[PDB]
Structure 1
């Protein structure tokens, strides 16, 4: 019945592991269009077309800070593009237009017969992630493009916290002890402003600003949650409803909140 379903039935163990069931390859985008540089990750054998997720780093940062998501998400059946921005000093709106430019270019490559992702993408099924200003950028993309199927920003930064217009299912990773984008004035008012969506707030206990980046010590839970959220909302895959909406009931989590998520 569900045509966007990919992969075998999830367990806690299969989502806590570093790799999911599909084989991953990557390539560097040859002529990046509307953004500085891109790396694309893709499953060779997903058994059908999959959605595309475009991930953006923070101010002064690079792909390295958010790369781990590439292998992790692609292995469970997604096309992931991680980007560098035109300038290290771009603010969240510019990060947004470049995030959407990356999705636009993944859609183009899906149509190009010489491209390693020829025919692998469902260009009607995309989502957005990013760290800090790239997180703020992810929220701006979702507000501007309600056709996105999912957002999952981490440690988000935006001097405007009102996202009340967002209808896209949104998972916010927060970092308890963030002193760059403190939760009390960033993540939390952002979460709290959204009244029209499936949403979730998941605060990493004793986490600093970088608590969700490559090399974090909570990859099991952060990665499980990130994959379950994209599987639930980008694939409509109700096999993942429990993993996506449940409280982890974990001492690794200092604050949990969810709404409109069964």
Structure 2
């Protein structure tokens, strides 16, 4: 049996819903260690330890741009930290270092008897997410820390599009009409550079650069996919293989690519 499987068998409609099966609570990190600020989202009733995910915004941006993922993922059985960077103008390398410091602090709080997440985290199972420069930072985190179990980035941007060393399962949401980090010159080159991993590319029809951010009109599809990808790869949960690897019939999806995503 899979010791990391949590929750009932999913369906497309239940993964499209706004909340998964677990109750979510949250707290503000009191003394952030190596990053600006953090909010920790966690399930109260997951039925065992769960993996941890750290999410980073883009240039100038704060937690609110990316924090819908917090309850979306936590309610399916994850501990999620959404961070503010030390400076809103930090670049992708710094964002990556901060993202890894936030994972480090989730692991420390897992061992802190006073923390709400004491004993809730499997600190051997971690993932990285982020928007734009925070997505570039996440890809650098994955390249530099190949024990990470999954990455899921949105409208990623970085100074280099060559992420060929990444062996971490990587999902990319791209936004069709993005003029900040365009699909043709940024998101698809990043995707195409990776030959050593499970990977996926989903282009959202008509989406602006913020098409995967909090308040987007496609939280059903985007949230299904992000949760399925993290469940499949962070939990090794093959009940999620169908949803993680599926080529969606969604009017929100304008392009789909995947490789090494076994059904």
Fold similarity call, TM over 0.5: yes
1:50 and 1:21 mapped to 2: Cα distance?
14
What count of residue pairs does the alignment treat as equivalent? 262
CA deviations 1:66-122 (Å, max 9, x no partner) are 010000000000000000000010000000000000000000000000000000000
Matches of 2:89 and 2:189 in 1, distance apart? Answer: 25
Q: Distance in 1 between matches of 2:253 and 2:46?
A: 32
Give 1:85's aligned residue.
Answer: 85
Give the deviation of 1:130 after TM superposition.
Answer: 0.3
8 Å contact from structure 2 (residues 221, 250) kept in 1: no
Structure-2 separation of matches of 1:78 and 1:159: 30
Given that residues 161 and 186 in structure 2 are in contact (C-alpha distance below 8 angstroms), is that contact kept between their aligned partners in structure 1? yes
Cα distance in 1 between the residues matched to 2:174 and 2:260: 19
Which ranges in structure 2 are unaligned for 5 or more consecutive residues?
none
- The CA deviation at 1:210 is 0.2
CA distance in 2, matches of 1:119, 1:131: 29
Secondary structure in 2 aligned to 1:185? helix
Deviation for aligned residue 1:167: 0.3
**What is the TM-score when the length of structure 2 is the normalising length?**
0.99
Quote the offset at 1:252 in angstroms: 1.1
Structure 1, unaligned runs of 5 or more: none
SS state at 2:141 partner: helix
Counterpart of 2:124 in 1: which secondary structure?
strand
Structure 1 residue 249: Cα displacement:
2.3
Query: TM-score, normalised to structure 1's length?
Result: 0.99
Give CA deviations for 1:192-250 in whole Å, capped at 9, x if unaligned: 00000000000000111000000000000000000000000000000000000010022
Report what 1:236 is aligned to.
236
> In 2, Cα distance between the equivalents of 1:246 and 1:224?
11
Structure 1 residue 171 displacement after superposition: 0.1
Partner of 2:65: 65
Q: Is the 8 A contact 2:41 2:70 kept in 1?
A: yes
Distance 1:120 1:100 in 2: 19
Q: Give the alignment's Cα RMSD to 1 decimal.
A: 0.4
CA distance in 2, matches of 1:44, 1:244: 25
- The Cα offsets for residues 106-154 of structure 1, whole Å up to 9 and x where unpaired, read as 0000000000000000000000000000000000000000000000010
